[PDB]
């Protein structure tokens, strides 16, 4: 215990030394973006109950959405059509994933199972391709690496990297104090970050499977996490109505985003294609945009009658989709 | 300006919307019931007699309800569109735990504005427990000897006044904790139930026939 504290005092002491300047002073000369206006262009209707997750497509035109009545729907974002409507076995689902190749779709929730569905079969139906079940908590995020590799973060303090043909766990990740909330993969595909209900964020390694770093600057549990486009930073949003920008090479907190008028928690955090706008969901029937450098408000995506539970920006950055508990998806330009 | 294929695409979309509307209707005539409870509570007998996620699909008088048990600070956000909750607590054995739990559930932010049904389970073994004398319930709450039921009790059986005071003190504790806050937002419905007794279904049927009626009256501006 004394040896661990020794290091604990010393690492902190070590880190203080690394810091030389803040972010506001350097980025003063960066002119503010200003006021930003986006208007609804589509309103996707057909979900009975509140929706929890959505995920765009690689072609930037199809999307998938998951609701609490046991419904996955694949939407054509141009003509508002409904390409597919799939029923789920468990009515409580918190996450959905759309494969980079466009052949598979993934879902999961309280059922303790992750389901992989095959889209481009030789018929007009969508059937179950794989049923991964090796967890004892509720899943909160699952992401595709390829058509074979999937990383799922669960409530049983474990993050698993699987293999789909067999159906057994391949690399298990442990080290979190509370249940895992959110997860995001790096563009370089080598690493990914995770956030759990212990106010701490943790990097990992895909191949070896070890916690390489750990970041802690929050007060309460972190609900959402996402990577920066560069791959050398990320951002978190937590229940204490705050967003944090964390760095990987510097291993230190960079900047915080919060205003005295916000009291509700943050549920989804996402980045623009370039990495200049930060879209943050909320529980006060809103969805805000922050200047990721100067830490200022830059407009409001008002228009929802309930809390915003899922956010997704398209790959080429020409649209943003927002879901809510009022069961209406809104597309903004 | 639609091609020969866009027309069929839109026809397929409309054929899907039909089915979606068919499902939305049936989704409005169903009432959902979250089932909380403690470890040793006799929920198993109740869910057997009405029949991770543990489900119940019982129906009564041409109306269908769906009961679900879970397994708490994290997944309570999901369960706020339910009609009501059938809370089960143990009675005929030592309670300070259970009261605590009731007091935390009754004040939850995502569980406000929802009425609570409250089964006091296993009374059958409370009749004997006080029949054996010794120290039944008074050692933990030194107020059973000092609490007296009024004349409005109207016991169903009246087999023993002692068990009547024993029942009514704990019922008063729960009712007090229910009415000590909430601004008339929701209401507790207590019952005395056992394991053996047949119908805790009608009771649930007659309940939540009052809650929706009350809501109805408040909307139509006459309450």
């Amino acid at each position, epitope marked *: 215990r004394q040896e661990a504290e020794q290091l604990k005092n010393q690492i902190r002491d070590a880190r203080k030394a690394c810091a030389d300047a803040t972010l506001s002073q350097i980025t003063n000369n960066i002119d503010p973006v200003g006021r930003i206006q986006m208007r609804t262009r589509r309103t996707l209707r057909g979900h009975l109950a509140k929706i929890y997750a959505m995920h765009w497509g690689t072609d930037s035109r199809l999307l998938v959405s998951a609701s609490q009545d046991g419904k996955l729907i694949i939407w*054509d974002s141009y003509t508002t059509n409904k390409v597919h409507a799939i029923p789920l076995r468990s009515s409580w689902v918190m996450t959905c994933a759309y494969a980079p190749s466009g052949n598979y779709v993934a879902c999961g929730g309280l059922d303790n199972i992750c389901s992989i569905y095959n889209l481009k079969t*030789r018929e*007009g139906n969508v059937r179950v391709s794989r049923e991964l079940a090796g967890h004892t908590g509720y899943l909160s995020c699952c992401r595709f690496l390829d058509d074979n590799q999937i990383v799922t973060s669960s409530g049983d303090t474990t993050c698993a990297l699987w293999d789909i043909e067999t159906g057994q766990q391949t690399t298990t990740f442990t080290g979190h104090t509370g249940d895992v909330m959110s997860l995001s993969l790096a563009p370089d595909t080598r690493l990914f970050v995770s956030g759990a209900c212990d106010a701490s964020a943790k990097l990992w390694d895909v191949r070896e499977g070890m916690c390489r770093q750990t970041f802690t600057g929050h007060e309460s549990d972190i609900n959402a996490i996402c990577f920066f486009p560069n791959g050398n930073a990320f951002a978190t949003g937590s229940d204490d109505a705050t967003c944090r920008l964390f760095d990987l090479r510097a291993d230190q907190e960079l900047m915080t985003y919060s205003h005295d008028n916000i009291i509700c928690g943050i549920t989804s955090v996402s980045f623009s294609k370039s990495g200049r706008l930060l879209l943050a969901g909320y529980d006060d029937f809103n969805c805000n945009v922050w200047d990721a450098l100067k830490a200022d408000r830059a407009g409001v995506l008002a228009g929802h009658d309930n809390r915003v539970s899922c956010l997704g920006v398209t790959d080429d950055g020409m649209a943003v989709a927002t879901g809510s508990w009022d069961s209406f998806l809104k597309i903004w330009n | *300006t639609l*091609s020969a294929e866009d027309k069929a*695409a839109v*026809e*397929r979309s409309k*054929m899907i919307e039909k089915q979606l509307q068919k499902e939305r209707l049936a989704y409005k005539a169903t009432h959902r019931l979250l089932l909380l409870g403690a470890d040793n509570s006799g929920k198993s007998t109740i869910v057997k007699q009405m029949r991770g996620i543990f489900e119940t699909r019982f129906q009564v008088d041409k109306v269908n309800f769906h009961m679900f048990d879970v397994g708490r600070r994290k997944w309570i956000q999901c369960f706020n569109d339910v009609t009501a909750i059938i809370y089960v607590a143990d009675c005929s054995d030592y309670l300070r735990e259970s009261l605590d739990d009731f007091e935390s559930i009754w004040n939850n932010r995502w569980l406000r504005t929802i009425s609570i049904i409250l089964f006091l389970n296993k009374q059958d073994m409370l009749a004997e427990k006080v029949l054996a004398g010794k120290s039944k319930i008074e050692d933990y709450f030194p107020e059973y000897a000092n609490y007296t039921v009024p004349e409005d009790a109207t016991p169903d059986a009246g087999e023993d006044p002692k068990v009547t005071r024993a029942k009514f003190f704990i019922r008063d504790l729960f009712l007090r904790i229910s009415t000590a806050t909430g601004d008339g937002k929701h209401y507790c419905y207590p019952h005395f139930t056992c394991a053996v007794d047949t119908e805790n279904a009608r009771r649930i049927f007659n309940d939540c026939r009052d809650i929706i009626q009350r809501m109805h009256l408040k909307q139509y501006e006459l309450l």
Partner: single-chain antibody
Amino acid sequence: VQLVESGGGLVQPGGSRKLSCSASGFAFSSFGMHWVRQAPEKGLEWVAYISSGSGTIYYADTVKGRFTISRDDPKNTLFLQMTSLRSEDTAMYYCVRSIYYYGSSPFDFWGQGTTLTVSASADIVMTQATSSVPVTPGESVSISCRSSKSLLHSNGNTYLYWFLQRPGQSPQLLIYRMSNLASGVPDRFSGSGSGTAFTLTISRLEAEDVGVYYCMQHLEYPLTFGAGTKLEL
């Protein structure tokens, strides 16, 4: 996936017939269906079309009011009734299936077909340039086709289909919308165009590339196949 036809034979003039195409191996109710006929020594022509849910029906201008088409999803089989058999009504028929959503592949499967013999208009025109081409293994083929009107739409879609019929088999889909490969076809084939002049290019030639090549359009619903082009080794 298997579509099998029933009916056909020798009939007297002026009679009536009923042909039934039965499907077993795929989800019938999500698919639209067509009938396509072929003359004893000529190309292919379109006869009818029924949608999914029976909410839209089309016929050919030739037989606009003499044939009827209907399906039984619970029985899982489609059929047509044929009346007032002319002298042109002698042919051999196939039932084709298709599906329409964003990115699908219509006309992706053909039936076996059955033969019917009888005893004793502003539509797009496709022109097949060369009616016969001599080829040898391991060289390139450059089949061409010409269209009366530009087939490209405002969005960008093209609606050109390439079919290849072997001697003794039904046609198979190779390219849909002028640029997309089919599922089970090799990467040897390629297709291109500029709205009116369409080209199918083969780089390496094998022994199974022998047959007749047909084109097709899907812009305006009365849809015409084309004469074809024969390849021999």
